[PDB]
Structures are given as C-alpha cells and as structure tokens.
Scaffold this active site. Structure first.
Site, PDB file in Angstrom:
ATOM      1  CE  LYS A   1      -4.141  -1.874   0.390  1.00  9.67           C
ATOM      2  NZ  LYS A   1      -5.074  -1.981  -0.757  1.00  9.67           N
TER       3      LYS A   1
ATOM      4  CD  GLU B   1     -10.073   3.510   0.625  1.00 13.15           C
ATOM      5  OE1 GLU B   1     -10.112   4.742   0.473  1.00 13.15           O
ATOM      6  OE2 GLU B   1      -9.257   2.788  -0.038  1.00 13.15           O
TER       7      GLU B   1
ATOM      8  CB  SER C   1       0.110  -8.109  -0.696  1.00  9.71           C
ATOM      9  OG  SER C   1      -0.764  -8.861   0.163  1.00  9.71           O
TER      10      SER C   1
HETATM   11  C1  0JO Z   1      -7.987  -2.757   2.185  1.00 14.23           C
HETATM   12  C2  0JO Z   1      -6.807  -2.779   2.878  1.00 14.23           C
HETATM   13  N1  0JO Z   1      -5.808  -3.780   2.693  1.00 14.23           N
HETATM   14  C3  0JO Z   1      -5.905  -4.605   1.559  1.00 14.23           C
HETATM   15  C4  0JO Z   1      -4.745  -5.539   1.402  1.00 14.23           C
HETATM   16  C5  0JO Z   1      -4.793  -6.424   0.311  1.00 14.23           C
HETATM   17  C6  0JO Z   1      -5.937  -6.362  -0.659  1.00 14.23           C
HETATM   18  O1  0JO Z   1      -6.095  -5.150  -1.385  1.00 14.23           O
HETATM   19  P1  0JO Z   1      -5.609  -5.014  -2.900  1.00 14.23           P
HETATM   20  O2  0JO Z   1      -6.440  -5.972  -3.718  1.00 14.23           O
HETATM   21  O3  0JO Z   1      -5.967  -3.589  -3.238  1.00 14.23           O
HETATM   22  O4  0JO Z   1      -4.135  -5.311  -2.972  1.00 14.23           O
HETATM   23  C7  0JO Z   1      -3.709  -7.301   0.140  1.00 14.23           C
HETATM   24  N2  0JO Z   1      -2.690  -7.315   0.998  1.00 14.23           N
HETATM   25  C8  0JO Z   1      -2.596  -6.496   2.054  1.00 14.23           C
HETATM   26  C9  0JO Z   1      -1.426  -6.557   2.988  1.00 14.23           C
HETATM   27  C10 0JO Z   1      -3.629  -5.591   2.276  1.00 14.23           C
HETATM   28  O5  0JO Z   1      -3.498  -4.773   3.351  1.00 14.23           O
HETATM   29  C11 0JO Z   1      -6.337  -1.654   3.724  1.00 14.23           C
HETATM   30  O6  0JO Z   1      -5.248  -1.758   4.350  1.00 14.23           O
HETATM   31  O7  0JO Z   1      -7.017  -0.614   3.797  1.00 14.23           O
END
Ligand code: 0JO
Ligand code: F9F
Ligand code: F9F
Ligand code: 0JO
Ligand code: CS
Ligand code: CS
Ligand code: CS
Ligand code: CS
Lengths: 395, 268, 395, 268
Positions: free
Chosen positions: C86, C108, C376
C-alpha cells in the site's frame, strides 16, 4: 588458548564455568574457519540480500531538522526482516550452528526482537529453537511473544530476579551449560564470553559498511558522528566498526537513563557502573557496594540490562567513542516526534539514539553537523506500551 | 595450614573416602545456619563446602538458587559470612572449609584482599565457579600467597592439557564434575570416570572429590569405589532445609540422619 | 471528456455524483502531467528507494516446496516501509495531492495498511490525514489503529452497514463530495471511479517490473505464473501489469472464499457476483436479486469487500487472467505453514495467494512450475486474530 | 405525459414557485408512508421527490440514510415501491412524481425495463444520483423512450459546457444543487446562484428546482426570489418522521404545519 584475542584492553575474557570452555573454543574455531570460507560468505550474503532485505535504506530526515544546521540520516535497520538489526547476526550464527552439527538453538531475549530473529532463522534453517524471556518483558513486548510462538519457537517466561533481560540471560547460560552437546547458544548481543563480542560485531558490521557507502554517495564525505543506542552493544558496534579507523568520525553510544541516573533506576553501567565479572565477561556493571549485581531499569526492554559489551568499555576507556544517557521521557518524546514528523515508528530502544541526536541539534542549532542515527528497529512491539503511557499522562 | 592434606592422610590410613556437604551460609538465617553446620559436622561431615550468597549464581539450579534467596531475605552479606566463618573455625579447628564463590564477589574490592580475609578467618580453599583455568592466574596467585587452596574443575570431557593444568594449578582437592549442567539433586551425576581419576593421580593432582547430582549413599559408595577420594552433596542437603523451614528441630534430625547415611557410604 | 480511457472493456467508468466530476478530471490531468514530469518521477523514485526501501527482495522458498517440482518465489512487499505494498502508491498519490495544492487527505482502510501508509505519507509530506475504518476492522486489525494514531492521523470508526471496508469506502466518498476543494481522496485500491484504477496500477507496477528483473536474474526466464490476492485489486494489478504482454506468463488472482462460496459468506464477486454500479464504477459485485449491494465476508479485513477493480473484471473476461478463491481455513493453514517453515509471518490477505500456490503445488506435485506469489504484507496486524482462532480451535 | 410542464405553466400564471418535499418510500412502513405522502399533498406540495430504499446511498447524509434503514426494517423492496407509486398516482392524477434512484437499482435487471416500469405506474421523472451527464446516455435514452424526464444536476461550480449539456439532456426540471456535500438539513445550502439560474434560462433548460440543505421557509423564498422555479426539502421533512415514530398523529400534524409554511414561502 584461543585463536583470537578475547580482550579489548582490560575488558572481556571467558569467565564461564570450566564445562563450557570447549564449546566456546569450538565456536571460535568454527567462526575463524567460516570467515575464510567463500561458500559460507556467499550463503550468508545471499540470506542477507534475498531473505532479510539488505542493504537497508539510509533515510534523510526532511522535517525534524528544519531551521537548524543539522543534517540527519537514519540507517533503516527497522526495515530488515523481523523488524530489527538482530536478524543480521542471527543468520550468521544459525549458519555456524549448522556448520558445527548442532540442531537446537537457545536464545535469550528482552525486546523479543532477538527472539523473533532466532525463531525465524531456526524455522528457515531447520533448527529447534527455545527462547528465554523475562516475565515482565513477556508482558511489555507481548507482540513479539505471539510472533515467536507462531514461528514454532518455545518461549520460556523467566520469573526469577528482575524478570527482565539479565534473568533471561542467566537461564539461557544455565541451560547451555547442560545442553551444549546438541544446542548452540545464539547470544543476541556483543557481550558475554569470547568469542561472542567478536562474532556479533563481525556479523553486524555491514550496518556501518553500508552507512559509509551510502553517506559517501549522498554527501561526498563521512558523517561528523554516528549515534546508536547501547544495551549489550550489538547495533552500536555494528554501526561503529567500519568507522573506528576514520578518526574524524564521532562514535556516540547512548545508554538508557531510565527514570534518571540520580534515581538509580537506569541501565547505564558504562558511565555509572564499575568493572565487575558477570555473564562470562569482565565489563562495567551496575553492582552493589558488596559486588551483588544490581537490577537495571529502562522503559525499553532491549536496553534493560545492568552491563555492556567489553568492546564499548574499551572504546570509551581510550576516548575513541563517547557514551551518554537518555531518560525514558526523552526517549518517548523522540518516539512521538519521529512518528508525527517523519512517518516512522521507531523501537523505543532506537528512540534513545534519536533522542540524543535531537539534543545535539537543539542544544547547538547553528552547529553544522552531519549525523547518522542507527534506527535499530521498528516500534510495532512498543505501540501498546507507549499508548498506555500517553493516555495515563492525559494525552 | 594443611587441613586438606591432613584430612586425606587420615582418611587414607582408615581406608575411607570423604563426605563433604554443601550449604549456603546464612540459609535460612545466621543462627539456624550455624546450628545446621554444627549438625553436619556432628553427624560425620569430613569437610565443608560453603556458599556465600550471590545475586546471580550461574552454576546453580533452582534448589541452591532458592538457598541464596533465603539468605538474602535474612539480610546475609559476605561480611556476615566471614563473621560466621570465624565462629565455625573457632569451634572446629581441623575440619577443612572450602568456599563456593562467584568471581564478582572475589574480584569486587580486590582479589588479594578477598583471599587475605579468607586466611584471617581460617578458610582452607576457594572454588571460584565462573573462573576457568584459562582466566585463573591472579586468583590462584592470590590464593597461594594467603595459604588458601585454589580449587579447579575437571569436567567429564576434560582433555589431557586440561588434566595437566588442573593437576598443576590446584591444591587441596580436585573437583571431579559428575556431569554437565548446573547443581541439582534430581539430575543424577554419571558414574565417576575412572580414566580421569587415574590420570589425575598420574599427574599428582590434589585428591578428587566428585560433585553435582550426588544425593544418595549409593552414589557416594560408587564414587569411592571408582577411586575418588570422596563426594560432595549440596542440593540434597539444601532440600532438607527447604522442606523443614517451619520445623527447625525436625530439620536438624533429618539433616543428621541423611549426613550419617552418606558418611557411612564413604567407607565402601 | 477525459484524457485517458475510463473503461476496461465494459467495466469501470465514473459513476459519481456530478459534483465530483471536476475533482476526478483535475486528478486525471495532474496524473498525466506528473507522468511526463522528470522532477516528479525523480521525487517519487527517491521516496520509494530511500524512504520506503525499494527494491523489495524476491525470496526463494527453501522448505515449503520440498519433494515437488514447484519452485516458488515470494515478492517481499511485506518488507516495504509500513508493512505492505500500500505504501508504494500512497507516496505517488501524496505527491499528486501536493501538486494539486491540497493539504488534507481522506482515506478508507480495512486491514489498516492503507491507513498506515496514508498516515505515514501525510506525516512525511505535511498533510492533515483522516481515515475511515469500519468498527469491526478497528477491532480485528487493532495494531494498525494504534500505528495510525501515533502518526497523528484521525481515525474515524464506521458503525454503519457491515462496519467493514465497503462502509469505510462509503463514508470516505461522502466526505470527499463535500471537502474536495481542500482534500484529496487517497483511494487505496485499483477500484472506484476513473482515474483511480489507472493511477493505482501505474503507481504499483514497480512490483511486477522488479519481479521480472529479479526472476530473469535468478532463473534466466519468466515465471510460469504470478499469483496475488484480490480485494479491490491493487497488489494484484501491480504484480500483473508488467507481465500482461508476456502471453506465456499466467496471471492468477485469488478472491476470498470466506466460510465457503456455497455459504454466501465470501468476498468473491469477480467469479460469483454479477455486474453492477457502485462506488463509482461498473464492476462485478455481490448483490441481491433486487440490486441491493450485499455485505461481503472474509477472515481478512483487506479482502472483505463485495466488489473488485474493473481491470481485473476485464482481464478475466478476455481470459488473460484467471481468478480462483481460497477459504478462511485454507488461508490460515498457509499463514501457519509460512511462519513455521520459512520464518515469514504473512498478512492474512497475502496468505490467500500463498494458499493457492500451495494448492497448485500439492494437487500436481510432479508438474514442473516456476511460480511467484506476491507477498503483499506482513502479518503483525493479524497475530492476535490468528492466535485467538488457533486457541479456540484447541491448538 | 406533461405533468411538470403543466405544473410550471400553472405556477407561472399564478406568479408562484414550487415546493417539493422528499421522502423515502415506505418509511417508517408502507401504510404510514402512504398517509405521510397524502398529508404532504393535502398540505400544499406541488410535486414529490420519492426515494426508493437503497443499501448504500452515497449522496445522502445520516438523516436520509436512516430513512432508508427504517424502510428496509419494514421489509420495503423496489417492487413494493412500484405498488405504492401506482396507488399514489391513482389518487393524484396531475401531481408530478420524481424518483430519486441510485444507479444499481436502475441498471439491475435492465435499464429499459426500469423506465418501462416507471411509465406504467405513472412516474414523471427519474433522477439517478450517481450517474453524471458523462455516463448518462443509456439512462436518458431509456427515460425519453418511456416518456420519463431524466433529471440532471447543475452543481455550484458548473462550467459552461456542463450548463449546455444539462440544458440539452434534461427534461421536466433542472436540479440546482445548493452546495457540495451530501443531503442534510443541518448543512445549509448557499443562496441560489443567480448566474447559473440565468444561464440555464438562456439555454432553455427545464425550470430549476434548488435542493440540498433547504429546511426553512426563508430559504424557499430566497430560492424563488433568485429566479429558481422552486425548492426541494428532504432531511427537514424526514426529521419530522424520525422524531414522531411513536406518535403517528402528531407526525402528520407536524408534517402538515411544516409543508404549509414551506409552500406559503414559495409565493414570495
Ligand atoms: C484494504 C486494505 N488492505 C488490503 C490488502 C490487500 C488487498 O487489497 P488489494 O487488492 O488492493 O491489494 C492485500 N494485501 C494487504 C497486505 C492488504 O493490506 C487496507 O489496508 O485498507
Ligand atoms: O549436589 P549438587 O548437584 O547440588 O551439587 C552441589 C555442588 N556445590 S559446590 O559448592 O561443590 C559447587 C562446585 C562447583 C560449581 O560450579 C562449577 F563447577 F562450575 F565450578 C558449583 C557448585
Ligand atoms: O433537503 P436535503 O439536504 O435532505 O436534500 C434532499 C434532496 N433529496 S433529492 O431527492 O432531491 C436528491 C437529489 C440529488 C441527490 O444527489 C445528487 F445530487 F448527487 F444527485 C440526492 C438526493
Ligand atoms: C535485547 C533485545 N533487543 C535489544 C535491542 C537493542 C539493544 O541491543 P544492542 O545493544 O545489542 O543493539 C536496540 N534496538 C533494538 C530494536 C533492540 O531490539 C532483544 O530483542 O532480545
Ligand atoms: Cs537542516
Ligand atoms: Cs545496558
Ligand atoms: Cs522444489
Ligand atoms: Cs473482494
């Protein structure tokens, strides 16, 4: 008889029960052998790069030095896998354990960062890991207890004495003196009996080596000073080592001042203790008039230890490095300041080093100075402790 | 003096081994500790090994850790231990007395002054638990200057160089370690290693006393039959103290019974 | 009218109240301008390298593939400053906010990783940050709430609806529609109205670019597949982008299966929802027969969202990428397995991707395959949740 | 039909502005909602703006969010809203009825079918809140095919291109947004922007109704005096419902009092 010098001037040595001498000699021979082994060096380098994430960034502070003539960089050991510098030398020692045919690891931990490092390296390299941790620290560094256990390490709370790092150290050494045939003692700081202060330094010295290359690249010169907190001494000696021969470069070590040196509730033996023999070494220690070892104190578990590594005692004695203290409240202010103005949450240990650098700047704000602080770890493990303090304080 | 030499010559003449109990000085208090020690002697102890309470005893298991803690709770300091020692020697002129020390307590206000204090109160040996032969020079030098025997340790996996150094540097008795680990009655020492006993004799070492995990008469007999000059028992003795804190008379009766049985076993 | 295409086939668009169109157009123009601006690119590159810690390691798993013909690498976004991918695009968007003369940030967050990233970038770059977070997530991702607040961000619990990510999204957008004159909406995933899915992809694409260079270096060829979990789609599109034109390279996205697709308690609209209009985009969504938006579910807060970014819907439609699901129990097993056998504690979101890769290996253990999993984030934020589960389970 | 056209021609002849209340269909239940709506009409409403309950109403503040929730708690679905609409039209043949929709509810089972349903029950306009002019083509096309007026929004910072598109694409009335943000009685709309009102007239746009934050008679008068054809009030009306849930008679009396006062203000 040893291959390498166990002393730094008057300080260091091998003050262990006779039973453990062969283990220490075996460790020293294995280290000397590994240091000249290109396959060992390549394995260690590969783990540091591709597993731990080295080289770690050197970050220029953008906001906290505004309006002064201080340029401050932070060596980002908080970005290393596991979240502290502890992971560097654990990878090297784990490889030595394997090299000596050992399949079990004993470690002590205070902040739980060495314990996390020990658990992660053991999971990766197929070693059975048991970790001693003082019961007070099990509470105040709890996130690391959950991390260690999820990685399959056994975590053994130590209730004896002060229930903090020295007591975990005592139990680890007691255990090793009975289990050394199959267990390697993965000591986590630049202290204890030879060869540990030497091995730990040599397996941490990439910190200062990288710092030097990075500052040369960005500034075209060496730092005026490098500043590091000092528990047992590993992150500080890792930062210092490669600069020892650069006589212009100040080496500043920061001991914990606790509630204030005057209260006796601190962890600053190098400047406020006196030479004693304990934990396998001759070094400055906090001790009673009669020679009982005193219990230390610091808000930070990683610094809460009543002694210090013998190479720091030596560097101080000859004036090559200077040592200072920072209180709990000074550390907390530095923690808050870095969070809010640089978007980095530092370990409370590392915040002692930062607090000193901020003092250097604030006390003499028109002094031109290029400083590096070793940001030894991230503060995730500290967030509940700090929150609770700032709330009780009415913030 | 020559208290160990005289003891071993006497034991040899009687074709007998030594039984040497260990206690912590001032556990559970100074007065009771003195009575405990008199009871050990009356029950047949040939020599004593006496602990000075230390904050971080890294060669000791929980039983003796807890002895140190009880002494500290009673406010026992090394100064008070030296006052006790003077009183013990005054009552008992010939019994060899050995101190179990940790290095910091010896090093604290000067190594020479420590051994000088030992000589003044009539102590015969000092065993510094966390000083290996490799670091021992200023300790053994000070001991010998003050007519104190420096005691060194022969571990189970002692090599030849170590055997020779222990034989040369030590006096009084040689410590024959039963096993690795720390003090503890539950962790039973291995059978005395005949090869080490014989090599120590070959090198004219001070006579060997086997210690660590010796808690039964059978183990005392086994040590002597293997050629050791005797055996040391600490944790087994200390447990009798710990068990009987509220019952000081029962404490001394059980100490007497146990010591008598362990001594009887030294004649095997 | 726009400078760039707001659609990926049928999916995407700008389905916002008319009031917000000028803000979206302004953002798009600023992005296009910044993309051709060498000073912007240099500032962004410097922050990524010297502040965030890029490039992140590519780690070969040493143990978890033993006995199979699978070679598995993990792209270590868990090592990035803040603890997840992120942080990459937050640095870019924060610079865009500054470029547009805005001094406030709305974000958010679900897992709290985007919120942490937003708070840290705002502290560094001098922006006032407010973060909306569903009340359920405030509880299950609590360590991130403490981190955000220590960095000076305002954290606003959202109790409405499911009290999870979609509800935080709703509040953020409601807020922006009144505050856009002074506030930039730092949307944290590759979803929402154009230009967000495009900007987020372009500011995450270093993940796949680095992966490609690293796999070429270590293996001399491209991966057979790259595998990533899919909440709104940012980490997956960041990994995928640079491989889209490498037709041999499989692109596998993993949606959360929750308690099982059959229970209706999941977050897998791409494969189990149907096209709708919500949160500014035309995309697959979990919806009732009547077109009410359904509440999603996943053990992982970062995946607990009833829609998906429109570029993923598009890539699926044309068969360029394949999408699968992983249940809560599968994710937990993968979490445990990585902790114990590789000494890495993964985010529960990332554990969905890992679980799928482990399935690919286990189902066909003699299939030769070179896989990359996008790791991630780190799982510090999840340790209390996972502990509580494994204890209730009798472990 | 031509219900808005006829209304505005009549209002113009009487030199009067429109007062148009908003409520959520089926809040707090179907029967009470129908009574509320009859009360609004009897008290002087010139037209109605009626919400179909939607799960995630992104242009609405808490007051109307809570209206949607009350309707859902009563089990209200869009099908039941269409049954209500048929009943309302059956009682009230000439009053213009506009729906406030979110895109998904229109798009769900086909855009064309949605507007066909609106025509069958006798709805006059549809305002889709999250479809800007830029995305509006299939919506406005379907609306016009089914004799429904598609309503578009003129925000305070509308540029010239937008003014022209809203004037061309819209029918029935033009929505003149008071302010940025979401629906809410506490956040008072700005004074109607004369320049936008005048430009809309220059471009022959459907007559303007000002909305968002209009909760007092003074604001209604100000809108009309600025040249708008009338004003919409939602949250102020809905709060009267929310306040009086346990008192349905007091609810209708207060709704009547408020609507009468707001309508009186439209004659200024
Ligand atoms: C929605 C959140 N996190 C999503 C997230 C995700 C899923 O979101 P994306 O599909 O946008 O990567 C994957 N891996 C990690 C470590 C994450 O924190 C947030 O931190 O607001
Ligand atoms: O019977 P146990 O198991 O309690 O053993 C009691 C031994 N007491 S002692 O003073 O001889 C004794 C002797 C040596 C010690 O450590 C060292 F070997 F490292 F030097 C510790 C205690
Ligand atoms: O009086 P308030 O502040 O409650 O406002 C009530 C307005 N109700 S409404 O149906 O006209 C209405 C009109 C447009 C809306 O959103 C959009 F502008 F984006 F399209 C939302 C509601
Ligand atoms: C003693 C511990 N930690 C010490 C520590 C220290 C102090 O130890 P050294 O002096 O050995 O660096 C500094 N910084 C961090 C992040 C630390 O975790 C431990 O984790 O076991
Ligand atoms: Cs500066
Ligand atoms: Cs210290
Ligand atoms: Cs393999
Ligand atoms: Cs999702």
């Amino acid at each position: 008889t040893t291959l390498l010098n166990p002393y730094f001037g008057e300080f260091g040595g091998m003050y262990v029960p006779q039973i453990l001498m062969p283990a220490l000699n075996q460790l020293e021979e294995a280290f000397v052998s590994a240091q000249k082994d290109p396959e060992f060096q390549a394995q260690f380098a590969d783990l540091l790069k591709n597993y731990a994430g080295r080289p770690t960034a050197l970050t220029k502070c953008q906001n906290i030095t505004a309006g002064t003539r201080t340029t401050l960089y932070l060596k980002r050991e908080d970005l290393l896998h596991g979240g502290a510098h502890k992971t560097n030398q654990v990878l090297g020692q784990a490889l030595l354990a394997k090299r000596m045919g050992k399949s079990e690891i004993i470690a002590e931990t205070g902040a739980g960062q060495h314990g996390v490092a020990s658990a992660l390296a053991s999971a990766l390299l197929g070693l059975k890991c048991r970790i001693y941790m003082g019961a007070k620290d099990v509470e105040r560094q709890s996130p690391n207890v959950f991390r260690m256990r999820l990685m399959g390490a056994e975590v053994i709370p130590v209730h004896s004495g002060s229930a903090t790092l020295k007591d975990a150290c005592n139990e680890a050494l007691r255990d090793w003196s009975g289990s050394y045939e199959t267990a390697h003692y993965m000591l986590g700081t630049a202290a204890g009996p030879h060869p540990y202060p030497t091995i730990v330094r040599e397996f941490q010295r990439m910190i200062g080596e990288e710092t030097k290359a990075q500052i040369l690249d960005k500034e075209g010169r060496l730092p005026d000073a490098v500043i590091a907190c000092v528990g047992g001494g590993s992150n500080a000696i890792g930062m210092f080592a490669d600069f020892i021969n650069d006589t212009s470069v100040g080496l500043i070590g920061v001991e914990p001042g606790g509630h204030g040196i005057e209260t006796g509730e601190h962890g600053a033996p190098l400047k406020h203790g006196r030479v004693g023999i304990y934990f396998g070494m001759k070094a400055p220690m906090m001790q009673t008039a009669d020679g009982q070892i005193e219990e230390s104190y610091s808000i930070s578990a990683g610094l809460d230890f009543p002694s210090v590594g013998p190479q720091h005692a030596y560097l101080n004695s000859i004036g090559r490095a200077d040592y200072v203290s920072i209180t709990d409240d000074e550390a907390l202010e530095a923690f808050k300041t870095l969070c809010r103005h640089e978007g980095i949450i530092p370990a409370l240990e590392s915040s002692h080093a930062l607090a000193h650098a901020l003092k250097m700047m604030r006390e003499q704000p028109e002094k031109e100075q290029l400083l590096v602080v070793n940001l030894s770890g991230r503060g995730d493990k500290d967030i509940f402790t700090v929150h609770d303090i700032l709330k009780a304080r009415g913030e | 003096m020559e208290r160990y030499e005289n003891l071993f010559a006497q034991l040899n003449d009687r074709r007998e081994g030594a039984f040497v109990p260990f206690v912590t000085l001032g556990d559970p208090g100074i007065e009771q500790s003195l009575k405990i020690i008199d009871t050990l002697i009356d029950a047949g102890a040939d020599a004593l090994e006496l602990g000075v309470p230390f904050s971080d005893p890294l060669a000791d298991g929980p039983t003796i850790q807890n002895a140190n803690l009880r002494a500290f709770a009673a406010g026992v300091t090394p100064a008070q231990c030296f006052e006790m020692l003077a009183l013990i020697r005054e009552k008992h002129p010939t019994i060899p007395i050995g101190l179990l020390m940790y290095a910091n307590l010896v090093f604290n206000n000067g190594i020479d002054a420590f051994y000088a204090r030992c000589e003044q109160v009539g102590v015969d040996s000092v065993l510094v638990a966390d000083v290996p032969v490799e670091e021992s020079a200023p300790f053994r030098q000070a001991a010998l200057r003050h007519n104190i025997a420096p005691i060194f340790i022969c571990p189970p996996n002692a090599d030849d160089d170590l055997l020779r150094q222990v034989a040369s540097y030590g006096r009084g008795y040689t410590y024959l370690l039963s096993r690795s680990g720390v003090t503890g009655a539950e962790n039973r020492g291995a059978l005395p290693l005949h090869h080490l006993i014989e090599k120590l004799k070959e090198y004219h070492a001070a006579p060997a006393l086997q210690g660590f995990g010796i808690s039964s008469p059978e183990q005392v007999s086994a040590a002597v039959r293997a050629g050791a000059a005797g055996a040391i028992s600490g944790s087994a003795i200390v447990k009798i103290i710990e068990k009987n804190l509220a019952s000081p008379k029962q404490m001394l009766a059980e100490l007497r019974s146990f010591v008598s049985a362990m001594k009887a076993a030294s004649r095997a």
